[PDB]
Design an enzyme around this catalytic site. Sequence first.
Site, PDB file in Angstrom:
ATOM      1  N   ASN A  59      -9.108  12.645  -3.466  1.00 42.08           N
ATOM      2  CA  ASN A  59      -9.867  11.718  -4.146  1.00 42.08           C
ATOM      3  C   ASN A  59      -9.234  10.158  -4.312  1.00 42.08           C
ATOM      4  O   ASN A  59      -9.841   9.062  -4.022  1.00 42.08           O
ATOM      5  CB  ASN A  59     -10.463  11.962  -5.588  1.00 42.08           C
ATOM      6  CG  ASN A  59     -11.282  11.163  -6.326  1.00 42.08           C
ATOM      7  OD1 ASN A  59     -10.979  10.008  -6.830  1.00 42.08           O
ATOM      8  ND2 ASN A  59     -12.620  11.407  -6.001  1.00 42.08           N
ATOM      9  N   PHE A  85       1.833  -1.350 -10.254  1.00 43.59           N
ATOM     10  CA  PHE A  85       2.600  -2.398  -9.652  1.00 43.59           C
ATOM     11  C   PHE A  85       1.935  -3.266  -8.715  1.00 43.59           C
ATOM     12  O   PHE A  85       2.145  -4.336  -8.375  1.00 43.59           O
ATOM     13  CB  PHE A  85       4.074  -1.787  -9.233  1.00 43.59           C
ATOM     14  CG  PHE A  85       4.988  -2.991  -8.785  1.00 43.59           C
ATOM     15  CD1 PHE A  85       4.919  -3.486  -7.595  1.00 43.59           C
ATOM     16  CD2 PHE A  85       6.122  -3.636  -9.574  1.00 43.59           C
ATOM     17  CE1 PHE A  85       6.033  -4.625  -7.082  1.00 43.59           C
ATOM     18  CE2 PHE A  85       7.101  -4.399  -9.276  1.00 43.59           C
ATOM     19  CZ  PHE A  85       7.059  -5.073  -8.021  1.00 43.59           C
ATOM     20  N   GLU A 145       8.330  -2.309  -1.080  1.00 46.18           N
ATOM     21  CA  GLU A 145       7.846  -3.764  -0.806  1.00 46.18           C
ATOM     22  C   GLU A 145       8.758  -4.513  -0.361  1.00 46.18           C
ATOM     23  O   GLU A 145       8.484  -5.590   0.404  1.00 46.18           O
ATOM     24  CB  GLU A 145       7.890  -4.212  -2.489  1.00 46.18           C
ATOM     25  CG  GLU A 145       6.890  -3.711  -3.503  1.00 46.18           C
ATOM     26  CD  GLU A 145       5.489  -4.013  -3.032  1.00 46.18           C
ATOM     27  OE1 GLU A 145       5.176  -5.153  -2.223  1.00 46.18           O
ATOM     28  OE2 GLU A 145       4.594  -3.523  -3.599  1.00 46.18           O
ATOM     29  N   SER A 204     -10.093  10.114 -10.409  1.00 44.86           N
ATOM     30  CA  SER A 204      -8.660  10.582  -9.855  1.00 44.86           C
ATOM     31  C   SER A 204      -7.792  10.739 -11.257  1.00 44.86           C
ATOM     32  O   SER A 204      -7.001  11.712 -11.304  1.00 44.86           O
ATOM     33  CB  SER A 204      -8.235   9.761  -8.782  1.00 44.86           C
ATOM     34  OG  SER A 204      -8.941   9.181  -7.861  1.00 44.86           O
ATOM     35  N   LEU A 255       4.135 -11.458  -6.465  1.00 47.05           N
ATOM     36  CA  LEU A 255       2.850 -12.194  -6.116  1.00 47.05           C
ATOM     37  C   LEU A 255       3.063 -13.404  -6.845  1.00 47.05           C
ATOM     38  O   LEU A 255       3.151 -13.455  -8.066  1.00 47.05           O
ATOM     39  CB  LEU A 255       1.466 -11.470  -6.360  1.00 47.05           C
ATOM     40  CG  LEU A 255       0.351 -12.249  -6.327  1.00 47.05           C
ATOM     41  CD1 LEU A 255       0.240 -12.830  -5.017  1.00 47.05           C
ATOM     42  CD2 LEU A 255      -1.046 -11.421  -6.832  1.00 47.05           C
ATOM     43  N   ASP A 295       1.488 -11.705   1.761  1.00 47.13           N
ATOM     44  CA  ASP A 295       1.506 -10.136   1.643  1.00 47.13           C
ATOM     45  C   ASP A 295       0.449  -9.763   2.685  1.00 47.13           C
ATOM     46  O   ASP A 295       0.193 -10.481   3.540  1.00 47.13           O
ATOM     47  CB  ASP A 295       1.486  -9.585   0.263  1.00 47.13           C
ATOM     48  CG  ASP A 295       0.072  -9.832  -0.553  1.00 47.13           C
ATOM     49  OD1 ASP A 295      -0.787 -10.552   0.260  1.00 47.13           O
ATOM     50  OD2 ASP A 295      -0.182  -9.223  -1.725  1.00 47.13           O
TER      51      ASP A 295
END
Length: 162
Positions: free
Chosen positions: A132, A104, A11, A117, A32, A20
């Site tokens: 996948n 996250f 990040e 998945s 965010l 972002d």
Amino acid sequence: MNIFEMLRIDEGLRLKIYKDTEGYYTIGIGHLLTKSPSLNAAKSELDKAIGRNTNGVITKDEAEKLFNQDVDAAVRGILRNAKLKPVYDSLDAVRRAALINAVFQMGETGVAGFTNSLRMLQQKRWDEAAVNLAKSRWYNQTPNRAKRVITTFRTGTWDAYK
Ligand SMILES: [Cl-]
Ligand SMILES: [Cl-]
């Protein structure tokens, strides 16, 4: 290497409001602020979060505190999630780190939708789930980050990060 160092790598750290990869207003370590296009709204959300008139800029301590709250919220969502909890419980410590990362970044609902998945992860079909996980908008928009996370699910080591 731990989830904190891991996410810090993915990040980065920014002390001023920024946008972002999707164009959303963010600050600190991937926190965010709003999906709204208004910088005013963003500013307002940041002041609410910090508990002060920030002026769109925070300090290191402040960024780290949001980050702590966010990692904790993330884990808690996984454990509360009916679809997530089980996968999480079945995995080793490293792979658990990779599921927290994905959450996250994409939210629990988001991760909870990867039905197929999740199932392969639970069955311990590493190579299969990696492929996948690769057929997704997530992998196409942020290929390098996704590559790292997926490699972590696949191998169970921090190699992609060292
Ligand atoms: Cl908050
Ligand atoms: Cl990327």
